[PDB]
Coordinates of C-alpha atoms in Angstrom, one line a residue:
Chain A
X200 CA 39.0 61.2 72.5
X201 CA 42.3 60.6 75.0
X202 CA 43.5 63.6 76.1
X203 CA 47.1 63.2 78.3
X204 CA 47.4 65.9 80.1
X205 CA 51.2 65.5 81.3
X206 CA 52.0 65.1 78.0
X207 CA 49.7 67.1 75.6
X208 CA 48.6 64.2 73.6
X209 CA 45.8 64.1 71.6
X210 CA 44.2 60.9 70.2
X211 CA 40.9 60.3 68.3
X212 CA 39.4 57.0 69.0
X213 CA 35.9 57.5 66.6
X214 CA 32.6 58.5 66.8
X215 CA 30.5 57.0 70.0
X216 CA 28.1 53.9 69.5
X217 CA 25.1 56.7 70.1
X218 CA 25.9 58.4 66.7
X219 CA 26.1 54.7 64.9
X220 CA 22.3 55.4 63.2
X221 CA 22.5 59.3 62.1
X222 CA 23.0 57.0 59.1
X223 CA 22.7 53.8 57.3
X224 CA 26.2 54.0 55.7
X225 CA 29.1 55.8 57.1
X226 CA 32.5 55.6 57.0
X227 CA 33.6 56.4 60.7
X228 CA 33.9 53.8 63.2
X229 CA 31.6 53.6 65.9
X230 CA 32.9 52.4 69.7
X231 CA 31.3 52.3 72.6
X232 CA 31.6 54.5 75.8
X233 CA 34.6 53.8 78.1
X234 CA 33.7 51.7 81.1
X235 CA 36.3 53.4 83.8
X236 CA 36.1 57.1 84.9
X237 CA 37.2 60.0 82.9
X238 CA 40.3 60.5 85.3
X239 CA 42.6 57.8 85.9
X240 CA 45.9 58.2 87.8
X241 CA 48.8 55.8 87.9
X242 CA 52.5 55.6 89.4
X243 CA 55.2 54.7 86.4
X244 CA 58.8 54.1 86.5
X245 CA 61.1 55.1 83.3
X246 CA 64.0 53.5 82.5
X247 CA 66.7 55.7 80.1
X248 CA 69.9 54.5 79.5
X249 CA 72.9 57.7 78.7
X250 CA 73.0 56.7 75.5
X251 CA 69.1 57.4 74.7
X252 CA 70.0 61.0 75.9
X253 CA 72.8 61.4 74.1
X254 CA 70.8 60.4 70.5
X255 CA 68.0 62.6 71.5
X256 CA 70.2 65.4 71.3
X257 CA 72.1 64.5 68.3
X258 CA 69.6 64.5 65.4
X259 CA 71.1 65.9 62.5
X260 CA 68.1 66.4 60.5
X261 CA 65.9 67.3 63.4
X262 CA 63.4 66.4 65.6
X263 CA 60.6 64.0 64.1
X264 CA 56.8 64.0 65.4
X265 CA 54.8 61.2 67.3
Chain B
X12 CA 6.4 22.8 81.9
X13 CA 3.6 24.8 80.1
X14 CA 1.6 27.7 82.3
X15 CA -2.0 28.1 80.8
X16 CA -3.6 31.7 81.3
X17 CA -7.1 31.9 82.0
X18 CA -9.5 35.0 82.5
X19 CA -9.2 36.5 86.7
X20 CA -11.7 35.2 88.8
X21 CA -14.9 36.4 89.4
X22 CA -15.5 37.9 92.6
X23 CA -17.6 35.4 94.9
X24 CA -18.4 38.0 98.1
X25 CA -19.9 41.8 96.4
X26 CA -18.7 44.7 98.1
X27 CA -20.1 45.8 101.5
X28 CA -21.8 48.9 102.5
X29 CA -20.8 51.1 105.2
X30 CA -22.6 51.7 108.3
X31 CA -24.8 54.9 108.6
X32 CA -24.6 55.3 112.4
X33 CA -20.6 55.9 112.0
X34 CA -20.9 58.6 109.0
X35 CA -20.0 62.3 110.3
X36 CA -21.6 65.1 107.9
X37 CA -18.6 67.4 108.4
X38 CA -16.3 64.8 107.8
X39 CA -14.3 65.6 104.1
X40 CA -15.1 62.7 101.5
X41 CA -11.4 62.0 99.3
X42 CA -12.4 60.5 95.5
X43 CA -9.0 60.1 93.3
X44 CA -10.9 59.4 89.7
X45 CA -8.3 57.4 88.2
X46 CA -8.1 56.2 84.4
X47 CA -8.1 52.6 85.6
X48 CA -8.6 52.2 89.4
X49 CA -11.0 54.4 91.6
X50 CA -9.4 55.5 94.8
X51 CA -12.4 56.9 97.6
X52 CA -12.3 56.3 101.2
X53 CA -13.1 59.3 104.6
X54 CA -10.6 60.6 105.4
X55 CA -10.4 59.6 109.3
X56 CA -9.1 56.4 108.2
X57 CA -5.5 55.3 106.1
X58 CA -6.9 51.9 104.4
X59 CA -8.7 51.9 101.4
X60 CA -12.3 51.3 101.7
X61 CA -14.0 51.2 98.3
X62 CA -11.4 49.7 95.8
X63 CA -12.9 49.0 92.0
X64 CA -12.2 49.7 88.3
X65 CA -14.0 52.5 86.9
X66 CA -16.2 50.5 84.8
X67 CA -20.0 49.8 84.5
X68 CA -22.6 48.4 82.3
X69 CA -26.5 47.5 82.0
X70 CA -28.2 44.0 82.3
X71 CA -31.7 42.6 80.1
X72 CA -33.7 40.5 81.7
X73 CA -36.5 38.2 80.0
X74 CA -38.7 39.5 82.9
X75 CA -38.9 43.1 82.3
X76 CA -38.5 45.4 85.1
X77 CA -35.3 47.3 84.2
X78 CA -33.7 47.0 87.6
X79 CA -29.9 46.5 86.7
X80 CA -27.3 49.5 87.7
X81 CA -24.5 47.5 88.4
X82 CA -21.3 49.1 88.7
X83 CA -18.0 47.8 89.1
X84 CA -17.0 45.0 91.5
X85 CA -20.5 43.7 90.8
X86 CA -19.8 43.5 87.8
X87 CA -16.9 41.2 88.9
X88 CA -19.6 38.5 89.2
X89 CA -20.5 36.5 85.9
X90 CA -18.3 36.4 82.4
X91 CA -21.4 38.1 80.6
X92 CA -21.6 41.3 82.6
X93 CA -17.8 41.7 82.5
X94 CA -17.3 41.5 78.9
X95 CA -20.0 44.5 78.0
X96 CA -18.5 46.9 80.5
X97 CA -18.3 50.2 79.5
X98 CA -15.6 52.6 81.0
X99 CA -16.3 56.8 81.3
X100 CA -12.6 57.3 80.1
X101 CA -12.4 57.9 76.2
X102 CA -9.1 58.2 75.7
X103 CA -7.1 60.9 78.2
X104 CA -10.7 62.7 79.0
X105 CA -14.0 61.7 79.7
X106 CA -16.5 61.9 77.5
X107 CA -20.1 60.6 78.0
X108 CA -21.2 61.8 81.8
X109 CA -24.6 60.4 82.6
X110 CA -22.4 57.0 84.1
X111 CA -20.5 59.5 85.8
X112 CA -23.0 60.2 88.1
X113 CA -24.5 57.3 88.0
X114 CA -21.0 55.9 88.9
X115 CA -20.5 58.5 91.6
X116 CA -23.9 57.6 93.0
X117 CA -23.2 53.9 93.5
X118 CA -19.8 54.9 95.5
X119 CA -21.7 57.6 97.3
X120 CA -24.4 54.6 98.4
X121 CA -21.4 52.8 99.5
X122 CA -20.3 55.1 100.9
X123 CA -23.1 54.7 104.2
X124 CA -24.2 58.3 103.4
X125 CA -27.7 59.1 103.9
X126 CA -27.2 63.2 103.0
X127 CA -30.7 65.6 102.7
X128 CA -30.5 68.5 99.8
X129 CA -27.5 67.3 98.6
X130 CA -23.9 65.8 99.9
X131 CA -22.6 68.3 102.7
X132 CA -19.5 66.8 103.1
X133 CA -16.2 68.4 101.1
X134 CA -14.7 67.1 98.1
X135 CA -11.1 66.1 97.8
X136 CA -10.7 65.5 94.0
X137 CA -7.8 64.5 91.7
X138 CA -7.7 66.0 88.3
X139 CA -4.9 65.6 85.5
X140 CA -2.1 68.2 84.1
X141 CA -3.1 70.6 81.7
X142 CA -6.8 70.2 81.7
X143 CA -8.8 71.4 78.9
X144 CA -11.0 74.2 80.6
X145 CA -14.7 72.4 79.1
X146 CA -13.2 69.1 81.6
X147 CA -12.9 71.7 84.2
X148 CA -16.0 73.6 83.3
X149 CA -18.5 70.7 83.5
X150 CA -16.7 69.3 86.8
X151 CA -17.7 72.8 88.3
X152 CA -21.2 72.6 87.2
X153 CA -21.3 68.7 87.7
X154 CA -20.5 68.8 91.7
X155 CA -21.7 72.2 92.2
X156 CA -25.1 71.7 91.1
X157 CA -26.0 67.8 91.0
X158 CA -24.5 67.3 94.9
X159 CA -24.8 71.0 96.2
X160 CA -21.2 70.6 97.8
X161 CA -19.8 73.1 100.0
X162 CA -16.2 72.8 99.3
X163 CA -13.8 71.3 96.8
X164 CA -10.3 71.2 95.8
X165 CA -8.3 70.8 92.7
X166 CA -5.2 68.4 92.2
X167 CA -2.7 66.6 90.6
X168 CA -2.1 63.0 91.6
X169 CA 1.6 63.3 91.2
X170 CA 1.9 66.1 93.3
X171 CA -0.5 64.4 95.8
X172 CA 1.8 61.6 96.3
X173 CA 5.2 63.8 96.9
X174 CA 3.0 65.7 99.6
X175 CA 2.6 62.3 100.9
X176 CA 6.1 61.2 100.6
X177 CA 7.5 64.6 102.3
X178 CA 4.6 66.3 104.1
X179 CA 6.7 69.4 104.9
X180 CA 4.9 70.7 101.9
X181 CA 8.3 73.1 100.8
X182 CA 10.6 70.3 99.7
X183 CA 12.3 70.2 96.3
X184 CA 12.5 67.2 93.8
X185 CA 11.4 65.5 90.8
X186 CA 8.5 63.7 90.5
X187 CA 8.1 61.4 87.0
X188 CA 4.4 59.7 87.0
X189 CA 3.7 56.5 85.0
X190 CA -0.3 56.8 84.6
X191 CA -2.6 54.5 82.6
X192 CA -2.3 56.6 79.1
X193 CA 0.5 58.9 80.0
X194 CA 3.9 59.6 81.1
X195 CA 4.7 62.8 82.9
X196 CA 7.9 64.6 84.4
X197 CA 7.2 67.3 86.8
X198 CA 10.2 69.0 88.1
X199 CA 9.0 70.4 92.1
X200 CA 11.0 73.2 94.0
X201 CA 10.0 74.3 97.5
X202 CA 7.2 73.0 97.4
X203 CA 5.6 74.4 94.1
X204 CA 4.5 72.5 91.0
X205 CA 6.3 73.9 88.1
X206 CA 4.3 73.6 85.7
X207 CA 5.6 75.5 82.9
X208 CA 8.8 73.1 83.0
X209 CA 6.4 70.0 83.4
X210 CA 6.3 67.4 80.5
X211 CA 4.1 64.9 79.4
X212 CA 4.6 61.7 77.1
X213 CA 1.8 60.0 75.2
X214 CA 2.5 56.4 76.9
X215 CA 1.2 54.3 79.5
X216 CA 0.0 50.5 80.6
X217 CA -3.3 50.5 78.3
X218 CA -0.7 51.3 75.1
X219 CA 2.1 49.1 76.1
X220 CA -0.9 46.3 76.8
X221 CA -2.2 47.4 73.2
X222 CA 1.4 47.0 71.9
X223 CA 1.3 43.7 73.2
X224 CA -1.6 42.7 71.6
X225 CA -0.8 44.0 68.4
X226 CA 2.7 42.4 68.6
X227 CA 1.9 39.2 69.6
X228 CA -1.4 39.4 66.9
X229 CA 1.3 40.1 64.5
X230 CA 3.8 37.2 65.4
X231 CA 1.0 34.2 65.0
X232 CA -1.4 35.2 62.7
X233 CA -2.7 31.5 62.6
X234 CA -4.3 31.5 66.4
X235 CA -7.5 29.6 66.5
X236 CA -8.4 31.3 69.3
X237 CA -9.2 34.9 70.0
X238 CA -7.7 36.7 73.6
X239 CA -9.0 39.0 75.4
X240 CA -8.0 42.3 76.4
X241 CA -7.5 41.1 80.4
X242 CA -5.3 38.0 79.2
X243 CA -3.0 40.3 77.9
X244 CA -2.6 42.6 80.8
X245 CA -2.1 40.0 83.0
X246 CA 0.9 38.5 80.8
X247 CA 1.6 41.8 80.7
X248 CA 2.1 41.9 84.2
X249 CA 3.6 38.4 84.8
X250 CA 6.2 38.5 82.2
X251 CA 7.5 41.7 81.5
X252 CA 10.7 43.6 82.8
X253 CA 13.1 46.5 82.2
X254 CA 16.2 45.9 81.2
X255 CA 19.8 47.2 82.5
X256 CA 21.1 47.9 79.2
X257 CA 19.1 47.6 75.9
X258 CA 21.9 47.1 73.4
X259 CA 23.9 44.4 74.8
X260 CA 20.8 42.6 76.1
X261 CA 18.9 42.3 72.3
X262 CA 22.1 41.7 71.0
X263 CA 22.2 38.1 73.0
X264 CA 18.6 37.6 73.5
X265 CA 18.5 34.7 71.2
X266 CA 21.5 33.2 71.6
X267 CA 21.3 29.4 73.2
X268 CA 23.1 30.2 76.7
X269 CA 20.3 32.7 77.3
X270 CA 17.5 31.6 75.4
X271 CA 17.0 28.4 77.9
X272 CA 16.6 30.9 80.7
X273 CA 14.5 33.7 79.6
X274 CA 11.6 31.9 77.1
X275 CA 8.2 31.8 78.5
X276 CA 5.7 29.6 76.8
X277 CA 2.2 30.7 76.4
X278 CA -1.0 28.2 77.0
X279 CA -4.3 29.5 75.6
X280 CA -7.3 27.7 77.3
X281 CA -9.3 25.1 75.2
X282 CA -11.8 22.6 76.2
X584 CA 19.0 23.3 57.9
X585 CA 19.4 22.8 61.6
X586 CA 16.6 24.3 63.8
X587 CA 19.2 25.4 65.7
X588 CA 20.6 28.0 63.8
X589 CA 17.3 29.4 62.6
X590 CA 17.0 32.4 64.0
X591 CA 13.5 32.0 62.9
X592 CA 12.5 29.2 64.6
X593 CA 14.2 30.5 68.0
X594 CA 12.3 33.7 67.5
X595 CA 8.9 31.3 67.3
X596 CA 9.1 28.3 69.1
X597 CA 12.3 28.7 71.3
X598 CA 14.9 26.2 72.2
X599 CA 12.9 23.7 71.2
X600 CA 12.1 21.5 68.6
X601 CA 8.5 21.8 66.8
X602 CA 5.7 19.6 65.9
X603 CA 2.9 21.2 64.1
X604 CA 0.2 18.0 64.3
X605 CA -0.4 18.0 68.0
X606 CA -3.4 20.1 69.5
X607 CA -1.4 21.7 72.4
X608 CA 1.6 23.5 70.7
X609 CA -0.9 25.2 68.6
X610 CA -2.5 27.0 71.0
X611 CA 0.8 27.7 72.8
X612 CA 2.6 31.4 73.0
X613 CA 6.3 32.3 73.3
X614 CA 7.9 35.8 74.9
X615 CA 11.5 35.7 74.5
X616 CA 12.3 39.3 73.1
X617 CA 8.7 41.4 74.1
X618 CA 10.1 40.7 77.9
X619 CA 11.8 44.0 78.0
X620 CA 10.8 45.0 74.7
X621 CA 7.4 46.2 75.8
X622 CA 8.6 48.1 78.8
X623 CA 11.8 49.9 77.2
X624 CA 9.2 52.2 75.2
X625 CA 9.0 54.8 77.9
X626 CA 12.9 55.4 77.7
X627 CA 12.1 55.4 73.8
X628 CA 8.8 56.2 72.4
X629 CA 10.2 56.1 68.4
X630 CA 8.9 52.6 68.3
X631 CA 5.8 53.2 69.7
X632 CA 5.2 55.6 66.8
X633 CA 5.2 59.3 68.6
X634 CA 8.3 61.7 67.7
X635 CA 8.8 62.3 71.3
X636 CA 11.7 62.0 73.3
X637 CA 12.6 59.3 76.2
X638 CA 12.5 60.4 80.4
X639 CA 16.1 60.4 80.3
X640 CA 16.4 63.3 78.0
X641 CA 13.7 65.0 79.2
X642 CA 15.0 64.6 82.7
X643 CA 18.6 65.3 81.7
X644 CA 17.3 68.7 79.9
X645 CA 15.8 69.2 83.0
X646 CA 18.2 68.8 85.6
X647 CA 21.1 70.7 83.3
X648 CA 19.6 73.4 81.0
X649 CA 16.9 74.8 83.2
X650 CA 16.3 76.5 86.7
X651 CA 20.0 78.3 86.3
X652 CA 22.4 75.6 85.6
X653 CA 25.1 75.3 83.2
X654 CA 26.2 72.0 81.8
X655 CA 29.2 70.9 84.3
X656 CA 28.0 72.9 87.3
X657 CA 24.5 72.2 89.3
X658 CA 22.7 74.7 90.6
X659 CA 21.6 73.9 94.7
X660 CA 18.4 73.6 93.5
X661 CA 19.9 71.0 91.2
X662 CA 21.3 69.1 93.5
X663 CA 18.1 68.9 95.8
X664 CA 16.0 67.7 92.6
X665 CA 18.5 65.3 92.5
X666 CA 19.2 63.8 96.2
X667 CA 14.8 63.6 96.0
X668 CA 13.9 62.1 92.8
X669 CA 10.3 60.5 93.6
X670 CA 8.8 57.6 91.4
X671 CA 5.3 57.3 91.0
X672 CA 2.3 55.8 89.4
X673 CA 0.2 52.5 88.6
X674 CA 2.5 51.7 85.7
X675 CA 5.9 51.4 87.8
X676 CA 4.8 48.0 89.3
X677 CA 7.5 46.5 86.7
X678 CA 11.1 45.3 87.8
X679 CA 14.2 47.0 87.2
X680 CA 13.1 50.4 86.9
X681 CA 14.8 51.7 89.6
X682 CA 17.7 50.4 89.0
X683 CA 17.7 51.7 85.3
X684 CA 16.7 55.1 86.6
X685 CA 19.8 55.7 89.1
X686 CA 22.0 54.1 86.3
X687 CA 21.7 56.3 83.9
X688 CA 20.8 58.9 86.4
X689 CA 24.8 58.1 87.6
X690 CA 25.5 57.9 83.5
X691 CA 24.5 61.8 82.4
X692 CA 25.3 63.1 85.7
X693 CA 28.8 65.1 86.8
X694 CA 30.7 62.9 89.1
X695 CA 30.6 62.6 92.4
X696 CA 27.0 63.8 92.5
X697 CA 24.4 61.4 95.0
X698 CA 21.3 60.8 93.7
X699 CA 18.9 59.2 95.9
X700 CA 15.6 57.3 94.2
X701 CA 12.6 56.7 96.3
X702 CA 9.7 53.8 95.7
X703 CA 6.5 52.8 97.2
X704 CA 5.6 49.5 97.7
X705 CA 2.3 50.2 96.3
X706 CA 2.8 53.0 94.1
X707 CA -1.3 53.5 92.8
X708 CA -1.9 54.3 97.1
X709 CA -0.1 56.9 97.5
X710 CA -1.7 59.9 95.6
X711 CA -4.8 59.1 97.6
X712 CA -2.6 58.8 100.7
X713 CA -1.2 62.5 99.8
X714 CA -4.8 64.0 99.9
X715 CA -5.7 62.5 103.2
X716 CA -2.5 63.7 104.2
X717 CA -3.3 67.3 103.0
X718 CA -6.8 66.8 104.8
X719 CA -5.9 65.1 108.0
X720 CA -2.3 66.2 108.4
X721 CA -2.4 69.8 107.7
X722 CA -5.3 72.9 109.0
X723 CA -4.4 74.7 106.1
X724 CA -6.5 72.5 103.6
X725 CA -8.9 75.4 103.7
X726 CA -6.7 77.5 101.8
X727 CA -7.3 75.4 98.7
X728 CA -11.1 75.0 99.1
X729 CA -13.8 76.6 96.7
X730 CA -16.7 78.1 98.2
X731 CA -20.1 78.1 96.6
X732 CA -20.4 82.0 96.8
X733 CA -17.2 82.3 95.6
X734 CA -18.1 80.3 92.6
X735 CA -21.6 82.5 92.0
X736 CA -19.5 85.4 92.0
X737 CA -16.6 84.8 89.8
X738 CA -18.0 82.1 87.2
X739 CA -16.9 78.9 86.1
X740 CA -13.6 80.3 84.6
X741 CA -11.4 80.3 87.8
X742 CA -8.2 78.3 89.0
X743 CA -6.5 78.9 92.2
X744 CA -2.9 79.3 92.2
X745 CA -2.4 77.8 95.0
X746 CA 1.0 75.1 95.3
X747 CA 0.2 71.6 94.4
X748 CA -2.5 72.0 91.2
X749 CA -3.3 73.6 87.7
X750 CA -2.1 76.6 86.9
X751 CA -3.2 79.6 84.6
X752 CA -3.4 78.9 81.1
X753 CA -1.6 82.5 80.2
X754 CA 0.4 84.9 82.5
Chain C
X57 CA -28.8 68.3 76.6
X58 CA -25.5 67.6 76.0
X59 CA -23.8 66.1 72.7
X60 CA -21.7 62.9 72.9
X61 CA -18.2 65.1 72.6
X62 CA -15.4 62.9 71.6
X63 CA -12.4 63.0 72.9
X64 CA -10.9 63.9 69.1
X65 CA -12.3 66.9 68.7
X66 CA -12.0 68.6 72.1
X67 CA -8.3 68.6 71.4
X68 CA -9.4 70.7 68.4
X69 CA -12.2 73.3 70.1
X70 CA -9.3 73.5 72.4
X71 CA -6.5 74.6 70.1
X72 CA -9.1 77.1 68.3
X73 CA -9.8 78.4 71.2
X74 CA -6.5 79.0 72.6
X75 CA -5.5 80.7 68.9
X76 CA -8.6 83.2 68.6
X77 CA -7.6 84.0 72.3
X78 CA -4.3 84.5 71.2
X79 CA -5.0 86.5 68.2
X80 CA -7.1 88.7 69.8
X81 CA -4.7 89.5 72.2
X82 CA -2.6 89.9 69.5
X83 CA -5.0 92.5 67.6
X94 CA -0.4 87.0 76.2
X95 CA 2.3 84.2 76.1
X96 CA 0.7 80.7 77.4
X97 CA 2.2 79.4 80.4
X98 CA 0.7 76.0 81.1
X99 CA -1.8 75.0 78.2
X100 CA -2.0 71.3 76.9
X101 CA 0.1 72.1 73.7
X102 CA 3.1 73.8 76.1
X103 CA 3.6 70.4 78.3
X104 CA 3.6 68.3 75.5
X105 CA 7.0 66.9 74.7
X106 CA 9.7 68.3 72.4
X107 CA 10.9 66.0 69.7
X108 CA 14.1 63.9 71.0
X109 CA 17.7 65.5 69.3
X110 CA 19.9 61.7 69.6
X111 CA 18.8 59.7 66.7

């Protein structure tokens, strides 16, 4: 998985190469284990312009998902 | 350039005997009776006097007088008495028992001993996990009537050698043996032998050997000439290492970037491209075959069985046993037993792990360590240090551990089984004592 | 006298004994016997 935890994101990669031979055919995707560590940290810098803010808050229909 | 592999040599110089003016009577007498090396030498002394495999066998002569009782490193002498030997070990136990003493006599003659009514010296003695009680029944009635022996002692050789390797005697750790015909985990804390979270697997370096025969029998079934048992433990020996990761490392074992490095060719003694047949890479290498000349037919290739052989400890499914591999058993270990939660370790935990011990004959292979404290980092929680220890010898140091117990320590005589004692309570008894067997019930 | 005693069936005298022990306590939970420190089956596949 890739949890955010800023954000609340939630992502599904697949099933882990260790599960790849439960059995012969199946129709997830295997991947193997991340290299790094579990925790990573790392400095950003976010660029908005006023006009981004001002058509976040003028949907009309509403707010959409990710 | 082709390496040919011939039989060991024999042994030019037979073993000496020691002298009888240095023996002392009180002097304890250490035996470790090992499944494929003997291990005896006093216990004054820290090298290893009387070194052999536990093998013997019996000679005809066209003469007739039935004076042959060789035994071992004699037997290290001609092709013909070497290749009749006859070992005491059938399968994990022992079996037949008149070559036991017979065996035990010849070391005992060695030994400079010149002993009246019996042998009254004490018995250190090595003895395996979870013995079946008619093993330990007939040892009791084997020593304690054939050599009228004061004292003796019961232990395990694992447990031997992390005395040896921390003679505090209340440490905590884990201690994973590689024997001759089996694989055991033993988890220690203070000092104790817990044996009722011990575990054994049904491999060692006599089945990965036989693997290797069968294997390689199975690869050329057109050799024209039949090898031996000792050929095979010795390419065994030579050619065979663990690897760091077993899925990326088959995955590439054949490729041509890595199959010019890692291909060992074979000489037995005697007196449509090819290049993407994975066939003919998997038989004759990188290069090119000719099936008329005499020497590539007798010639042998090991480019997968390098760390195919030796991976079958961390998974024994294609050995054949349902079992599971000494990373599970160790991970189930170190998180789901002696209190601890998965995500938080226990103190006891955490001193298994800073004083994990490897021992036993079978570890002489490379790249277990590393393997060990790489997935020992991999199942882990983060942060955690986990210390491995090895010997440089690793089938000294059980003995080692006994002498230790013996020489080190006054409190040897804790252990000890008198003969009285023995008369009085029968040959169903175990002491309970810190470094042994323990009770079959509770 | 002794008989020759091979190793296959010791593993079986063993296991009978340890079960008529166990069911005549019955009619004591092992703690170390050579069935106890054998290993479980594996759970990855």
């Amino acid at each position: 998985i890739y949890i955010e935890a800023n954000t609340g994101a939630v992502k599904r990669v697949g099933r882990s190469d260790a599960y790849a031979t439960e059995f012969d055919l199946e129709t997830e995707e295997y991947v193997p284990l991340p290299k790094g560590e579990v925790h990573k940290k790392k400095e950003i810098v976010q660029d908005v312009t006023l006009h981004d803010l001002d058509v976040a808050n003028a949907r009309p229909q509403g707010g959409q998902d990710v | 350039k082709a390496v040919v592999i011939d039989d060991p040599p024999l042994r030019q110089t037979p073993e000496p005997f020691d002298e009888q003016s240095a023996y002392n009577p009180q002097s304890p007498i250490a035996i470790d009776f090992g499944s494929s090396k003997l291990r005896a030498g006093f216990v004054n002394h820290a090298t290893p006097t009387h070194i052999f495999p536990n093998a013997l066998t019996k000679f005809r002569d066209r003469k007739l007088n039935k004076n042959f009782t060789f035994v071992g490193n004699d037997t290290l002498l001609d092709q013909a008495v070497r290749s009749q030997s006859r070992s005491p070990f059938d399968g994990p136990f022992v079996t037949n028992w008149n070559l036991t003493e017979e065996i035990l006599d010849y070391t005992f003659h060695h030994l400079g001993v010149v002993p009246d009514n019996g042998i009254p010296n004490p018995i250190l003695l090595t003895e395996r996990l979870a013995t079946v009680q008619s093993q330990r029944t007939n040892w009791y009635q084997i020593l304690f009537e054939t050599y009228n022996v004061p004292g003796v002692t019961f232990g395990i050789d694992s447990l031997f050698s992390f005395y040896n390797y921390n003679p505090s005697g209340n440490k905590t750790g884990l201690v994973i043996s590689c024997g001759h015909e089996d694989t055991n985990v033993i988890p220690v804390v203070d000092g104790a032998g817990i044996l009722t979270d011990a575990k054994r697997i049904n491999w060692g370096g006599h089945q990965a050997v036989d693997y290797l025969n069968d294997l390689m029998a199975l690869k050329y079934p057109y050799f024209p000439t039949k090898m031996s048992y000792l050929q095979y433990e010795t390419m065994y020996k030579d050619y065979c290492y663990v690897s760091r990761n077993y899925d990326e490392d088959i995955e590439k074992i054949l490729t041509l970037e890595n199959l010019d490095t890692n291909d060992v060719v074979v000489e037995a003694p005697f007196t449509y491209d090819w290049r993407n047949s994975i066939l003919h890479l998997f038989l004759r290498g990188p290069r090119p075959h000719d099936s008329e000349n005499i020497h590539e037919q007798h010639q042998m290739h090991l480019n997968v069985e390098r760390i195919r052989v030796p991976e079958v400890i961390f998974q024994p499914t294609m050995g054949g046993q349902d079992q599971a591999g000494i990373c599970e058993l160790s991970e189930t270990i170190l998180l789901k037993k002696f209190g601890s939660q998965p995500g938080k370790l226990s103190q006891t935990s955490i001193d298994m792990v800073n004083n994990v011990l490897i021992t036993g004959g079978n570890a002489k292979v490379p790249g277990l360590k590393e393997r060990i404290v790489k997935e020992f980092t991999g199942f882990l929680p983060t942060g955690t240090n986990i210390t491995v220890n090895m010997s440089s010898d690793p089938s000294l140091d059980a003995w080692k551990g006994m002498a230790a117990l013996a020489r080190n320590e006054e409190q040897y005589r804790k252990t000890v089984i008198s003969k009285k004692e023995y008369e009085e309570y029968g040959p169903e008894y175990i002491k309970e004592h810190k470094l042994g067997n323990t009770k079959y019930f509770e | 006298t002794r008989r020759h005693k091979s190793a296959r069936q010791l593993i079986s005298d063993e296991n009978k004994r340890i079960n008529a022990l166990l069911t005549k306590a019955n009619k004591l939970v092992p703690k170390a016997t050579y069935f106890s420190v054998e290993a479980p089956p594996s759970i990855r596949p």
